[PDB]
Amino acid sequence: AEARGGLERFCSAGKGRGLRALRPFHVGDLLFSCPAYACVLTVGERGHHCECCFARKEGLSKCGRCKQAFYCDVECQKEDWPLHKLECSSMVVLGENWNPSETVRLTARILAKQKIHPERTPSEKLLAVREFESHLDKLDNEKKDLIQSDIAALHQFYSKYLEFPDHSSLVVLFAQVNCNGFTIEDEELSHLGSAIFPDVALMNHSCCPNVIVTYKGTLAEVRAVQEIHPGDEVFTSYIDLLYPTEDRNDRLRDSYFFTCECRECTTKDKDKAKVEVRKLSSPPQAEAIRDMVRYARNVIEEFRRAKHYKSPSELLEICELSQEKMSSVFEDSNVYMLHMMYQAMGVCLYMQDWEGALKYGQKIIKPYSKHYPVYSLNVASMWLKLGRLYMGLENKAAGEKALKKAIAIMEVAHGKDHPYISEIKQEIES
Numbered sequence: 328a329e330a331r332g333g334l335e336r337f338c339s340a341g342k343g344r345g346l347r348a349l350r351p352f353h354v355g356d357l358l359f360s361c362p363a364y365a366c367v368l369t370v371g372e373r374g375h376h377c378e379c380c381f382a383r384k385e386g387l388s389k390c391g392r393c394k395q396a397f398y399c400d401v402e403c404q405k406e407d408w409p410l411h412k413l414e415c416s417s418m419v420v421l422g423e424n425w426n427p428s429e430t431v432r433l434t435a436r437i438l439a440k441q442k443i444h445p446e447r448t449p450s451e452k453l454l455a456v457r458e459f460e461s462h463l464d465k466l467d468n469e470k471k472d473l474i475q476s477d478i479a480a481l482h483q484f485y486s487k488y489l490e491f492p493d494h495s496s497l498v499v500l501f502a503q504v505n506c507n508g509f510t511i512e513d514e515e516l517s518h519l520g521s522a523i524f525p526d527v528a529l530m531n532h533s534c535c536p537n538v539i540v541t542y543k544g545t546l547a548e549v550r551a552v553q554e555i556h557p558g559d560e561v562f563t564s565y566i567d568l569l570y571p572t573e574d575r576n577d578r579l580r581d582s583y584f585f586t587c588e589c590r591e592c593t594t595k596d597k598d599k600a601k602v603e604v605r606k607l608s609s610p611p612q613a614e615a616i617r618d619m620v621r622y623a624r625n626v627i628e629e630f631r632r633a634k635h636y637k638s639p640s641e642l643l644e645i646c647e648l649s650q651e652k653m654s655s656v657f658e659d660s661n662v663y664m665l666h667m668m669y670q671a672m673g674v675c676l677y678m679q680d681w682e683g684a685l686k687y688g689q690k691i692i693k694p695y696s697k698h699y700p701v702y703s704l705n706v707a708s709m710w711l712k713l714g715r716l717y718m719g720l721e722n723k724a725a726g727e728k729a730l731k732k733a734i735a736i737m738e739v740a741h742g743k744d745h746p747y748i749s750e751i752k753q754e755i756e757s
């Protein structure tokens with residue numbers, strides 16, 4: 328018998344172990360699904376999504392003791408209890424002082440799961456957590472310090488409720504989480520939480536992926552976005568494909584310890600349109616473009632840092648400031664301009680500035696459609712957010728057209744029967 332029908336684990340030369348198709352898969356076909364081995368809901372979503380299954384529901388029943396964990400029903404509460412019990416009492420005693428990072432909370436759950444079920448689970452038919460690559464030999468000083476900081480935080484927040492393996496085993500585990508972890512995003516690409524999907528972790532990376540990972544609660548689903556021929560390796564993208572080749576590879580080396588050699592990374596064809604410059608009298612010299620690229624990659628970091636000391640209103644100004652400055656060199660379609668417009672849209676949405684968010688959305692959509700693949704969750708989510716803004720702003724004609732563009736991509740990536748599709752169709756009707 329086949330562990331996963333039409334697929335097998337194999338040795339991909341220069342890429343360790345990988346996933347291969349045995350039979351053809353065509354666009355929109357489901358290769359496999361994988362329940363979460365461990366998952367944790369992001370703090371920001373407490374009271375809005377079930378802590379166990381991540382369902383977005385009104386009227387979630389809360390935990391009687393800590394009054395902090397929220398659930399669909401007693402069944403979700405019971406499934407989560409082995410994990411929630413590690414935090415419940417600590418959240419009662421320490422208030423806002425109990426703040427382990429999301430990665431630390433996830434790793435605590437993996438430790439709890441490993442102890443109870445040493446044998447392979449249904450989320451490990453092809454690759455087990457114990458087999459995950461860690462790359463300890465490639466970790467630099469800063470990366471080693473970060474893991475050590477995470478281990479101290481784990482002892483700090485869980486020592487009273489969780490027994491630990493030796494320090495070296497914890498180092499290996501946090502390192503495995505870094506190169507095999509997933510984040511779960513909703514239909515608008517909002518961050519819901521972090522998870523471990525061992526069989527999904529088997530797939531190698533390509534900047535030209537042939538599959539897309541989506542979620543049905545905490546169940547990961549893998550669907551083909553191009554034909555996958557018998558014998559082909561199955562590739563997902565580990566990163567945001569919007570960025571130029573150098574940016575993507577700096578991210579792949581930093582988190583996954585490899586340099587990509589895919590067709591897009593070899594030819595760099597998309598880089599010209601991604602770093603688009605404006606047609607002026609001059610025009611911009613290569614040195615001046617390099618300076619704006621460096622300014623752009625720094626403002627990305629400036630914005631992230633500013634979240635700690637600046638108000639949303641101020642963060643919006645950083646985005647406004649940057650766009651104005653970069654526009655002397657950069658076209659609106661330039662990816663660095665889009666990064667700032669996207670961040671500005673999120674701030675607008677947060678400050679209830681529906682109109683400001685809609686104007687940003689209207690500028691992002693066309694360049695997103697060009698830069699991203701045909702089936703991209705980033706493009707689908709942008710059409711959806713645009714559709715929802717128009718619908719909310721009493722423009723049903725433009726709203727319906729945008730929601731329909733989102734559904735058409737989502738039918739491929741999420742499957743025609745996905746609950747997100749039914750939800751959007753119910754928004755078109757009512």
Ligand SMILES: Nc1ncnc2c1ncn2[C@@H]1O[C@H](C[C@@H](N)CC[C@H](N)C(=O)O)[C@@H](O)[C@H]1O
Binds near residue numbers: 345459529585
């Ligand atoms: N395109 C690639 N080129 C080289 N190595 C890759 C590529 N994609 C993924 N990898 C490797 O696979 C790791 C991530 C794993 N989640 C993927 C399965 C991994 N190949 C394994 O044998 O466990 C990365 O940290 C790299 O070691």
Ligand SMILES: [Zn+2]
Binds near residue numbers: 377398399403
């Ligand atoms: Zn639930």
Ligand SMILES: [Zn+2]
Binds near residue numbers: 391392393395415
């Ligand atoms: Zn509780």
Ligand SMILES: [Zn+2]
Binds near residue numbers: 533590
């Ligand atoms: Zn690549």
